[PDB]
Amino acid sequence: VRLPFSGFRLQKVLRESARDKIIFLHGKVNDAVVILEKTPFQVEQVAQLLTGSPELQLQFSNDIYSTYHLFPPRQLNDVKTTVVYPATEKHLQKYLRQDLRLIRETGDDYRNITLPHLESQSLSIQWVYNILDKKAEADRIVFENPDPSDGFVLIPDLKWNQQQLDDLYLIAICHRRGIRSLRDLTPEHLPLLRNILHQGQEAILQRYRMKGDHLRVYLHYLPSYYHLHVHFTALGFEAPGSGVERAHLLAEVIENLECDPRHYQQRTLTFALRADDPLLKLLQEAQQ
Amino acid sequence: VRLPFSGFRLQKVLRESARDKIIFLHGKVEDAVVILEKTPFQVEQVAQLLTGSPELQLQFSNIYSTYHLFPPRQLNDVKTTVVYPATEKHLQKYLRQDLRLIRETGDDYRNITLPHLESQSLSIQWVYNILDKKAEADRIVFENPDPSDGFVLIPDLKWNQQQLDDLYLIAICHRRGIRSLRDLTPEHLPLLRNILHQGQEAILQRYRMKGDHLRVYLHYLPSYYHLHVHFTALGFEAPGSGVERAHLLAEVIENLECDPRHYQQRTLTFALRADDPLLKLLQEAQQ
Ligand SMILES: C[n+]1cn([C@@H]2O[C@H](COP(=O)(O)OP(=O)(O)O)[C@@H](O)[C@H]2O)c2nc(N)[nH]c(=O)c21
Ligand SMILES: C[n+]1cn([C@@H]2O[C@H](COP(=O)(O)O)[C@@H](O)[C@H]2O)c2nc(N)[nH]c(=O)c21
Numbered sequence: 001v002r003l004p005f006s007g008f009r010l011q012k013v014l015r016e017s018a019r020d021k022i023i024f025l026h027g028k029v030n031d032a033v034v035i036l037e038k039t040p041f042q043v044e045q046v047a048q049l050l051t052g053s054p055e056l057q058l059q060f061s062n063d064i065y066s067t068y069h070l071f072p073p074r075q076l077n078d079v080k081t082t083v084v085y086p087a088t089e090k091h092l093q094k095y096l097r098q099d100l101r102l103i104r105e106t107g108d109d110y111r112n113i114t115l116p117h118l119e120s121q122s123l124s125i126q127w128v129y130n131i132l133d134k135k136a137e138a139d140r141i142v143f144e145n146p147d148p149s150d151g152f153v154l155i156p157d158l159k160w161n162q163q164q165l166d167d168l169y170l171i172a173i174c175h176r177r178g179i180r181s182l183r184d185l186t187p188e189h190l191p192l193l194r195n196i197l198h199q200g201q202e203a204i205l206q207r208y209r210m211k212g213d214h215l216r217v218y219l220h221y222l223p224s225y226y227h228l229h230v231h232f233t234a235l236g237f238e239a240p241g242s243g244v245e246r247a248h249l250l251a252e253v254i255e256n257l258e259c260d261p262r263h264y265q266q267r268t269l270t271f272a273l274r275a276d277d278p279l280l281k282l283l284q285e286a287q288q
Numbered sequence: 289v290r291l292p293f294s295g296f297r298l299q300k301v302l303r304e305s306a307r308d309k310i311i312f313l314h315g316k317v318e319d320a321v322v323i324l325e326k327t328p329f330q331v332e333q334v335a336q337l338l339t340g341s342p343e344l345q346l347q348f349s350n351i352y353s354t355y356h357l358f359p360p361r362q363l364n365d366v367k368t369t370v371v372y373p374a375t376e377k378h379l380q381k382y383l384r385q386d387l388r389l390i391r392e393t394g395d396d397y398r399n400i401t402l403p404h405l406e407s408q409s410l411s412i413q414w415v416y417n418i419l420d421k422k423a424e425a426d427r428i429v430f431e432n433p434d435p436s437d438g439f440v441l442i443p444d445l446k447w448n449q450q451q452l453d454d455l456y457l458i459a460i461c462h463r464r465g466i467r468s469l470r471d472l473t474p475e476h477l478p479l480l481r482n483i484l485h486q487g488q489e490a491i492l493q494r495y496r497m498k499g500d501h502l503r504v505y506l507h508y509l510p511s512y513y514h515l516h517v518h519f520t521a522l523g524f525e526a527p528g529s530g531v532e533r534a535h536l537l538a539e540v541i542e543n544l545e546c547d548p549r550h551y552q553q554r555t556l557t558f559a560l561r562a563d564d565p566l567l568k569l570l571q572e573a574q575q
Binding site: 001002003004007008009010013016017018019020021022023025027034036038039040041043046047050051053054056057058059060061062063064065066067068069070071072074076077078079080081082083084085086087099100101102103104211212213214215216218235236238240242243244245247248249251252255259260267268270272 | 289290291292295296297298301304305306307308309310311313315322324326327328329331332334335338339342344345346351352353354355356357358359361363364365366367368369370371372373374386387388389390391411413414417418423424427445448449451453454499500501502503505522523524525526527529530531532533534535536538539542546547554555557559
């Protein structure tokens, strides 16, 4: 009934998520990670509490709505506490997560700052080509249009174990090379984009029995690697990644191109960067 | 204080989630919805608890060890929201349902969605209360009182105001009759900009949070049909901030600048519940 160490000095919040009601703490002892997570409610305990006189403090009241701070008895307050002692530097590194900042990249900013900065790094996407010519992961191919210009390869995301449909996640990687991102799309890629959208959906209906209206289909701007690929996710599955600051629906990307051929070269795209990403600093410096 | 009703007979669990530790309850008291949500942690006060004497209880063990922790009163705050009297619309709104996506064309909005929308929607009495100062007046963060281009920025109902990690404010325009994104024309640009700029700058004044820490957007299919803009901490993955729901204000403004008839002509994408009559009406029109 005690911690495996004496005393706890907070050195750094490695990561928090108010959505999941969780925190990851790094504290020195006497190196150790503590993790605190609020628990699910039990229906009967809450219902029992609400027939009575719960300890409440009013936050506000408007018409039929009202909110409060409730301070319930012991039974509902359980915090799942996961300690990690000792902690190597590799444990502290895998929990660390950087604050994100928003950036609004005009078309000119892309050509002058982002693109040059990207060309100065040499992101190897050799792994992608190995999938495309089946040197790697051929067993995982769900569907393929083999057309070198307008085709693609559909594969399940590495983390989706495939044992349920709640969290269905696939990605489509285009066969054609040199499409770095959203920024390179023009009406020329419309047939490719249409193939991914409608053949991708038809593929998933066949393999997994999931209708098209159960699919969020999108690209990421700022993607993690620079060779066009599209995400197909179950709609019921909510993660960061389908957020508006990063996800662009393929269907809408296609319609933008049909209405406005130069949309993705001329228009301003909004995305988030880690606060320590040199690109963030370079875009800021150029915008003031 | 006390709840605005007495008793509570659980009729049904509308929605229950282990992921984000929240429960939505339909009770008789006359209907009421009572929402209970576990709260984010306060950093300086967890560090205090751990260094003193925690109340622990071993469960699993190995370097991985697991416990049940029962903290003192301060860390146990549960965000409690009551709708009372709840209407039939409230009961369906919060009920766990299978969601389907729909791509609503400009014509689908005029012939199907809007006429359905004009039949009925949730009362907007709370919005009129904020604007007329009969409720929540002492929580106003910034008001531009211009009838047409003005708004009131106020803490969202969802936010318990205890930490910044889940900062959440809404800007509600003073001008009536702007039901949603689909009514926005270039004449609304000065308003939308006022919300973007004056809204962000007010957040900078009050909370010291820069605008690049902020996600600022509208919901399409909003639950309440009187234009209002959401302001959340970027680091907060807020429900309703997914691409199938949220439209960045700065992007809406620029859409309007490039193409004046954008939100009347273009196809929007949103999710509807399976028990939503709108979904069936739209699906019949598209088959
Ligand atoms: C009844 N009511 C609803 N809200 C908020 O206003 C927003 C309405 O936003 P919406 O875009 O119409 O969709 P949503 O209900 O699924 O989020 C919500 O985020 C609520 O948290 C409210 N916010 C305040 N401050 N006061 C209220 O009385 C009130
Ligand atoms: C090296 N690699 C990266 N990815 C995907 O690309 C994204 C970025 O990966 P990183 O964590 O290496 O930046 C992830 O979502 C992965 O799903 C990869 N996906 C597959 N299927 N196979 C690979 O070997 C591979």
